[PDB]
RNA sequence: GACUCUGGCAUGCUAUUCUUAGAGGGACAAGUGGCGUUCAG
């Protein structure tokens, strides 16, 4: 049983909000995992990138906790990246899954040559930066596949990017900065401004503003 | 059997300590002033609150089990004459120049004071 | 003879001088001094308590807000003023007192407000401090009823309305010389010299103006005709972003912004007293400094310390290796 | 965005900033969509229509959101000249 | 004001502004607030232009009126001078007041007793109330702020240039904001003066409370 | 089952006393007499 706390969770629990993209339209903070669970559901698969055991320092001593790096992904749509340190490995894994569900972002997909069929590749060459780690994504001709390291390959496969050339720079041995740089590059795929998006934006009513009469009763 | 819930307990304690004056002995008058007072989700919670507060006002008026009314009396104090309504108010020459530029140069309450 | 709390703070044993001694409960019970409560149970009991009338406190407030002193007054102060008013009205005829007092007369000078005039030890070009004069230096010292007020606001209102008041000296006083703080943006005067923000518009803009009130009831105040006083030199500077938490110190722009609590420890604020009878038994001549506590590591300082550092303009150049807290 | 066949091949079209024409991101949680009321020109009472301005989070960071909203209000006739 | 003759500043409003001292700004100046000042006088005090104050107040009232649910407006004061006025503003409008301590995590920490999600933020002082500005930056809340001359304009959308250090000026600004919101909605007539006088919105200062209970 | 939701009766509002389906009411131990630490029951 899900008992929502936020107004957004209340609207998602009912049928006032129909799609996730509306919440992405107004850049509202998704503070509950059950919203992503309700919208995407069984289409979300999870893939644990890495488990590192580490020794937490305490005056009691050096005691072990595990740190989970998990990339969750809705295919031909969305990714999320989660990092969680916890006592048990299963608790850390589910916490990283929750934190990756809270960080689900959309990815924009374009065409390499002429626009035939569904989009397959990154629209323009973008860059993601995290702690001296640079990940560059370049559009690729159809049928190439993801040409990258295994971790950005994992992220781009869960993004639904069918094909993308990649170039990395820096200490790519550390997995956290490399995965976060790839995630930042994926975010800047859609944050980029292109000549397609040059129309003046007509402003749709806000979800809190549209359904405020329903939210009076709750 | 039946028992009272703790949320009803704390809400009725708030209602007793806040607005005991307008509360009385009738059930429906207590219910309507209760739905007038607070932020209120549900009908059944309101009716449980009204019944519990009615029973405990049957209780406490037999025997025990003032600051907030004085506080709100101090809070809504209204003077007979507004402190803004002054006969002659001091004004700077630069403030007078600003008023003249803003077209309010025909005032009667201003007195220009030069920096001595 | 209405005794204000200032006489009780100064151990003014003028009980033999007067006979109509009248006091308020809330001008004697609030004193936190131990010696005053000690001597209170020792002093002869001929003082008696009397309550003013609401009409007379109303009238006293009515002309006190016309004098421009009403924000500076306190409730027990109005009790003392209206008690003296009621006593002089009920004993002496009421025709002596005058209401709606006189206007101000402005006469400025070239002297700075910080000129050290009327300080006892200070002498320009003889003024000496003798042990024959240590009992003499109280204030500007010059029949039946009077007051024992030490505050200038009380003397000001009592002398504007017309009562003869006195001091710790047995003789009645003649002139009142003091300073007041005047806002130079809103032109509102406050008799409380301790405050730094004005009550009306709240800016850090109060400046010193000297006031002399004669025995007639006429007041004249001197401004300073000096360009240094009204100078906008060290006033505009770039401010930091407001920080929160338990450790953040703010540049103190309003009189009532909530500062975090950063107090000193007891050992850090002990000052050595040297005339104690058991001081000579101390292994050290001085109270030991506090370095162990967390307040010492946070460099918490007293409000008194660092006063001339605030008076420097921020748009200047300090020493290269010094840091201003 | 739009393929050769003509379908809008895109998840959703993002809003752009009203002042600096930059795309508001999906997790730009400092971004603002503000509505300012319109009034009747004879009585000055609320009409029911409103004008909508969107400001990105960077302009709100820089402190230029106030000047941008004021400039748009002067442009749309909400704020009078001088 | 859209150059509407009904919405212009009148003589009584100007007299009120001069009586409180809203034109008397601070002594320091932030460079982004230089658009709202008139002139620098000789002794250092910055003069706040009252027409810009009126226009920004009308813009703020229009922004508040455009919020359909009156409880979606959150009105917060931290220091004492605004406190009563904020409560009184709620009595004028129905907006949700926070007087006293603003608990951090009010707008971001969802599992809390005092967690609330507004739609418009109105702030007495940007310097004192920096924490709700940060939370509003986190949760997409537009900000109204009663800004002085020395007030940072980070994360505010409508800055009202006025003196906010004195109790009379703060109470006057809140009272005219409430009056303009009620006039803009239409529940009170613009021709008749409002029956609530602005002295209801001022700070009480308990020693002055003792002095006023004395003269009764 | 001291957890969550919820029914009986509407000649009331909504496209409406006989069929509908949204909302708003109505029930809360509310009142009475006994047993009761005179309060929990
Ligand atoms: Zn002032």
Author numbering:
A (entry chain C): 59 to 276
B (entry chain R): 2 to 66, 73 to 123
C (entry chain y): 7 to 131, 206 to 222, 230 to 412
D (entry chain V): 1 to 82
E (entry chain A): 2 to 217
From the paper:
Similarly, we could provide a complete near-atomic model for human RRP12-B (previously ‘state B’), which could now be classified into three subpopulations - referred to as states B1, B2 and B3-based on the different conformations of RRP12 and the early recruitment of RIOK2, respectively. Several factors have been reported as nuclear export adapters for the pre-40S ribosome, including LTV1, SLX9, RIOK2 and RRP12 (38,39,42,44), which are all present in our RRP12 state.
